Amino acid sequence: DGANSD
Amino acid sequence: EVYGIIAMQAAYRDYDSGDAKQDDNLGGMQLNNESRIGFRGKKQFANFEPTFIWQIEGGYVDPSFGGEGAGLGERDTFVGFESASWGQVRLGRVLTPMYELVDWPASNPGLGDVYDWGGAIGGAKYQDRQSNTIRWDSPMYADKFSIDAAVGAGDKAGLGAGDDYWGGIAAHYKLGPLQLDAAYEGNRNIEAEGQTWENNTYLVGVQGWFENGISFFAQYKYMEADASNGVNEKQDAMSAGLMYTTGDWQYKLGYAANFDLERDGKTLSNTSDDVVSAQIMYFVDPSAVLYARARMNDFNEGLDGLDDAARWTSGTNGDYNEYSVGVEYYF
Amino acid sequence: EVYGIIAMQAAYRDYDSGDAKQDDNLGGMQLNNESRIGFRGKKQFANFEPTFIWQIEGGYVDPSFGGEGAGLGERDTFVGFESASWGQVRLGRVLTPMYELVDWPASNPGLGDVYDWGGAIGGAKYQDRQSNTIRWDSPMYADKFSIDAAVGAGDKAGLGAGDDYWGGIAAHYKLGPLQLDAAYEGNRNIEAEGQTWENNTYLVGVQGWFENGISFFAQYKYMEADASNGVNEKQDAMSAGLMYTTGDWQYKLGYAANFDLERDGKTLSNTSDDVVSAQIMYFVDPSAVLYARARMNDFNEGLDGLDDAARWTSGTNGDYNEYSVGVEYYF
Amino acid sequence: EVYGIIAMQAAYRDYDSGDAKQDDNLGGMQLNNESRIGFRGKKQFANFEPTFIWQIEGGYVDPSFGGEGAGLGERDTFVGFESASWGQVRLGRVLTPMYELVDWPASNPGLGDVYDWGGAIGGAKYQDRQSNTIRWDSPMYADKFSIDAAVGAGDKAGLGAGDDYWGGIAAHYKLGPLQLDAAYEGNRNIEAEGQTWENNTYLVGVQGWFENGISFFAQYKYMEADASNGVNEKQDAMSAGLMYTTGDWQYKLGYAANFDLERDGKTLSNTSDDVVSAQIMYFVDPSAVLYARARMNDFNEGLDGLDDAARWTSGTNGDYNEYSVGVEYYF
Amino acid sequence: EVYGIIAMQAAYRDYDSGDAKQDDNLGGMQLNNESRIGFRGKKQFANFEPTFIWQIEGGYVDPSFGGEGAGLGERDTFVGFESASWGQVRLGRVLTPMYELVDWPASNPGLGDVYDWGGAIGGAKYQDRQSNTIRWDSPMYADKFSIDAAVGAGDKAGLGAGDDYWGGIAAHYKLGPLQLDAAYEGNRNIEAEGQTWENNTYLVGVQGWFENGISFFAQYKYMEADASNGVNEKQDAMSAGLMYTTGDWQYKLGYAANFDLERDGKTLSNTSDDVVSAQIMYFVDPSAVLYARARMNDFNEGLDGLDDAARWTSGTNGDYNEYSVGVEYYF
Amino acid sequence: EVYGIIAMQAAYRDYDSGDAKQDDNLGGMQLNNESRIGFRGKKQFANFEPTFIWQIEGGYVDPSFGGEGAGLGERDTFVGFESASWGQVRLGRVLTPMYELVDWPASNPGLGDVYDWGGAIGGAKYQDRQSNTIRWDSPMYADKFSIDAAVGAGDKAGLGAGDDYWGGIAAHYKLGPLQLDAAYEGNRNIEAEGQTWENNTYLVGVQGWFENGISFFAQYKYMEADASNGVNEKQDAMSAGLMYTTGDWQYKLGYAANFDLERDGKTLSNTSDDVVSAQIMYFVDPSAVLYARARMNDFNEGLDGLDDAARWTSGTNGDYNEYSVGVEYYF
Amino acid sequence: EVYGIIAMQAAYRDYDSGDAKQDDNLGGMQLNNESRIGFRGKKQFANFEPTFIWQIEGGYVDPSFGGEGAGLGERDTFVGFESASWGQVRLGRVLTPMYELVDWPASNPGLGDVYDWGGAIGGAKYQDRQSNTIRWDSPMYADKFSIDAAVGAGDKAGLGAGDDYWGGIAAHYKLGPLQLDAAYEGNRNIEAEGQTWENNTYLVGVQGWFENGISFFAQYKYMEADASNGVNEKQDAMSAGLMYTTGDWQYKLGYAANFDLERDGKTLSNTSDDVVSAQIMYFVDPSAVLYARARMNDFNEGLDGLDDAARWTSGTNGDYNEYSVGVEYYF
Ligand code: NA
Ligand code: NA
Ligand code: NA
Ligand code: NA
Ligand code: NA
Ligand code: NA
Ligand code: NA
Ligand code: NA
Ligand code: NA
Ligand code: NA
Ligand code: NA
Ligand code: NA
Ligand code: NA
Ligand code: NA
What we know:
The PDB classes it as transport protein. Chain A is low in regular secondary structure.
């Protein structure tokens, strides 16, 4: 789970 | 107790970014090692009726596009108390009531680039796993219906660099073989793009598991956002999956999409994403699965934020296809 | 063996720094998750009488004002040998005999901003947890008095980026219900502000525990510092606490202050810090505590270093008060 | 299972780099704390005959020249399958078949500065423990002969920042008291020094253990490299060690050398390094060793790469000698 | 003597306010007749050295957006004394030292909506023409340097409905072809928005006239404001103009802007204004000019005061453009 | 009469397109032979007062990136009539009133890739040299002000494959050492990308020449376009150059940029280009110049048209820098 | 046989068109009398195995917004043949496979203004009831699945004023308590807006009735159209309803929407409709129902067709709400 934002 | 998920994925990605060298760099074969270790325990304090609970989960030990090594605490890490009557509260780093539904069932298989952290809206559509959080999970009242509720500090506030905060709520109703899902999250005081944002996201969804071997999920996601200069932004999304489970095999078809973003009532062209995904899974053991997966990501073409710079999205790196096999083992 | 300290503190910080935006950023509610996991063991080697000991302790998994995730090795992690007559020797990463007394009892409750890493003196007043260290802990001779002694490399030397080094010594003496403590630490070859410093810190203190339930500590700390261009710095500090433990409760009052810094004999005005703190602690279980705490930090008003630039202190960010509740559980 | 190696080395280095300050910074006493914790397991899947294996090993918790703390996943961390019939398959982060012989036996004692990551060739001589790797280790056929074979992505490809990749193979044959060894590695699409390289390394070596207590190893290494603008580099290296083990004692003499690099047929002056090393080891317990070690490193005096800038080597930081004692304990 | 300025402006305004009807009402063709008649005289009293001076100037006889008719006394109207040695003192209705520079040169051509009475700050940035004022004008000492200084009652105090008051000072220094300008004004006891304000405004500026016909001005305006409930406000502004005079023509390009308002350290988004303006002027006679002018005003989009209602600004009515020709005649 | 321009430019291009092979193909040393021969004449008809004029100009005889050889008529080729009273009328193939200003001075030196045919807008921002054209050139009324006016057939209409057409007008005003420039062009019935476009382009600019040897030009370009499916596009551009002329030498700095394109209110990210250019020119003879030139082009990253296919721009081939020396001789 | 539906609806409409009087005319209370009489028969011809069937149904005798009076033949009116083995063929005036699914279940309750004849697409999305139609209805093969297939002349062809025609097919599948619906229709040679169109509509849908009293339907509609001048249009719509039936009561919630129309790749802003509807129905008799219903229609804001004139939609007349009671009786 979680993201990869930037 | 020590626990883990041993999870390995061999993924080949074919990119179409408009830059040759970039296609060569981003694409190729990688190992995506999402294995993680955790420690957790309960404790009945002598002078407190609710039982003490705690967990420390590590991060992915070697994900794709990243270096090796994960620290303890990168994933769900918390303290809390739980009771039979009123459920459990958790303090620390947890999933948002909304995000848990965005991630499972709606981000599997490989729908996350579009539906999880994809999308073009400004501000913060929702959090995904936040530190500085208090979260309440009610029991399954009447073994039919449950509530998840949380408030927490924001990303910048957790560094002493801001005053963002957020609250969220989610509810589920069991109806025979169906599960109805509804969720909301509102983020406040978000500093980004030279503005201060407020976000409001809404989600409705259904899950079904049937004795005939068919199971499905579908979600509709509505995100609004408001900047401090009067600009309003809107984007909608959806995700659905269709599954046939026979014997030791699961056929799964997945589709997810973000639709055109609206800025101040004007539709922005080509700000949409969608992904189509197919997956064959083998229940190799009651505690493990093998799987093969192929997916197609079609991303937006880009958009400017409110600071006259490009706003990052999951499409910035370009459209791509991915073919993968993998293993997941739980202990 | 595996061991852990599960520690969560919900702390509200109210800043009054002279900038309302900065006050909003630094202040607010945060969760300070100081939970850590460690591994340790003993082992009797067949061909060596003194017993082998080792420990590897993890860092705080999610502190306030910081990101999530901590590695193994961030806290006390060492190898060493122990014998009944001559004590234990440890090589690796451990606290210096000086720091261990500044930390306990003198930094509790919430006095650390002033008495731990606070102060305006230049160079390196003392180390805290230090790698590349050898430390000897004497036994409690005659059940009356103990010695702690260590030498080690400095912060820069541990990267091959300096030749700093340090030594320290501390002693404890039991006199009925009182324990007298004295400590020294000298840091050498400290590169800062374009100079090369020598630090020498001296500490004496008393702790008492009485059968009537009152407990107290009091310490006086004296820091001298010498830059390589001839400047001399001196700063005095103090810390004291008074606590009453009755039944399942400990009421605690704490006060600590550093007094105005003296550079080349001139005391610099308004460079003093002090903190007052109140803490209610509840022994919720033999292995855990609950607590609520309030403290007021009034920091120094600023000073320049020897490069005519501002010198960082714990006051750089501004005065603040803190209200907090918390839990700590050991296993 | 949880397993660990508790490994501490106190090592003093006296450098001779041509700069007094540089000699001062890099030299001195340091602790090389290579302790590490790992998790490991097997599992018999219900619907797959070969046993599933996995391991997650943490990194060095506090090595010399580095800060404290290591994550889970930094060392051998993988999933895989094994069968008695065809050996073992491993996916993840493992040693390359070439590197495994370079490291053991040929890099011990303290020969690594020269024979492991030393050398002047351009590109990448071989990888040492690489993520995104699939590796087959065959069983020991006829209790005599084994094969190691692996392919994997390169350093830059593992970040989505390249298309580097590599393949390698190694073989061993046991012949009474001697074992003959051969290894190969080819690295491709290596982007460095403004060019793109192909590397090819070959290794042959012998190990011997005798009933009278003499043991030895000897290795010869040949590395070729070709840039995309036609430049060719070639370099020779060797490694040997001789040991007499009597009772609780192992005496070791070690030697390794790189010879002058040849670029476009031209031998480059002073591109050779060598190390001579002697080590005394004590088997203090079935699970631990104590050791004292001294070694002298004579490094190359410098060379420029194909961008007319200095090419980094293990000699860049200067020649140095090292005296060290240490302990390693396994559990 | 009787004197007048005969000044007529035909202006077409196109508003862009976000409301149709409002664009209809506020916009259109209008005649803005700023003609005014005045009387003034001097008198040398027999028993008093400084010469008595007095003036009574009428208001605009039919400005745009207003009805027709003006009283005698609406503009600069005063008594005073003047001497060659110490300058002149004026009691009555006069411009404040600060305002006079804001108006000229900094509000021409058509820069007034932004730089004259525009801006978002609370309280009262400055007075303009103020009754109940005493103002001293020093002579041009050494034909090089001059002072303007004034104190006066505030808008509410002049009706017996308050105790607001203010003081201000301005200076000019001639440096060859340049004139350096600085001005300050402080208003006190300003009752607005349920609070009591203090404003402090500062100004620096330069003017130049060059022998080839180039002239320019540029000013920087700094506005501070402090409410009695602890709120602090800050806004910066600027104005600049470029001029070429040859023969019977003057070309003028003008720009001015207010920047976003900063409240309690936090910047408010899009509380900035700016105006661009071009004007062509024909010197039709030594006593008159004809002129054509076009300008575009982009105003802030709105903001609330400290009573949570919209705070009126120069933008409240909406952005607009204006094209105008006009005539001015002096006698 | 015969006339010619003998023009040779030796130019090196270094490309950065994202593909090394393409970078190698497009880049390298080339000779750009822009020589052309022409014929022209006047003739006074016996029965027509205005003087008959005609010209036939050949194309570049060997431009870079093209094959050798050019025909008579590829450049300015026309008939027309002249009178001292009403100027000159030309029928045939001429530069459009706008393009003539785009090219000179605004495309020199080497700003043409950005400012001439660069840009992303759909349809046709303007024609450049256009056949099937009628163009009127007014005299310099009052030696101050002139008009250029033209109407003509479109690219497809001149092949009988469409009904595109265009009109354009430009005006120049002398203001001492300045020349004011305003131009407009409208193209209609333009078929592209499956749509039918209308373009409207506007330009304002100023050029100045000063007696001390400084000269400059500055231009601002505004292009809007409307497709038949209702899509509207808007893009801005600018170009400016600064020159110091001393003796036999002219120093030149040039800059031009296109800004991000606007489609239906959406800004398209990274569709802006810009170029900086430096040039030294030698007046080798009253009829010839030598020059050296260096320039850097930063192009847009691509965009799709309204047929969902890539829209060609001068950025299609990739960013590049250019170093060049050249000669031009007029006879 | 004589048969009838006696049906009266009392409906109050409140309009919001932006024009009073327009709101006043369209709004108010009306009676919508959809009562109708029909005659039917079966007949076994002596010399033809399939049974002859025929029907003649009259129209609504007095609908709202229309005059009184209906003839025989305005609704489903046909001759045909039926067989147990292959189903029935009908010639005459019938519902098209597709319209039947749009009308029932998807246009109830009061969803028709949006989902039936609503929509902005040009051409003819589908036919509804059409003359000159032959329609085949398959039997329910295996008590699971049925096929509907029909072809017919178009609206203009039935008056001898055109050559339009159409074909369509629909299929139904029983899956336990669910019915899956899929349908298609294509219209050809459709003359409108000065063009000749082809339309293609696709629909998928699901209906469910469950033993616990809940029933639901959901439909997805995708309409494409292509003009003879090459313009292409696309539009989406959907419809869903939720029903809980307990005893003599039915609660119904209905929602339908058409989404923004896409023309030649451009999204047309505000060309979407949606309606939400609630209905309470009382089963007043085995042959009759009473009902009360409320709905909200929010229609599109307008669009022009391909003749540059407004294209008529159900939104032309304005937004409105409707509150209504009604009765239906069958005999
Ligand atoms: Na990786
Ligand atoms: Na976050
Ligand atoms: Na829950
Ligand atoms: Na904060
Ligand atoms: Na001790
Ligand atoms: Na270290
Ligand atoms: Na590597
Ligand atoms: Na092996
Ligand atoms: Na790659
Ligand atoms: Na006033
Ligand atoms: Na004055
Ligand atoms: Na050529
Ligand atoms: Na053309
Ligand atoms: Na049917």
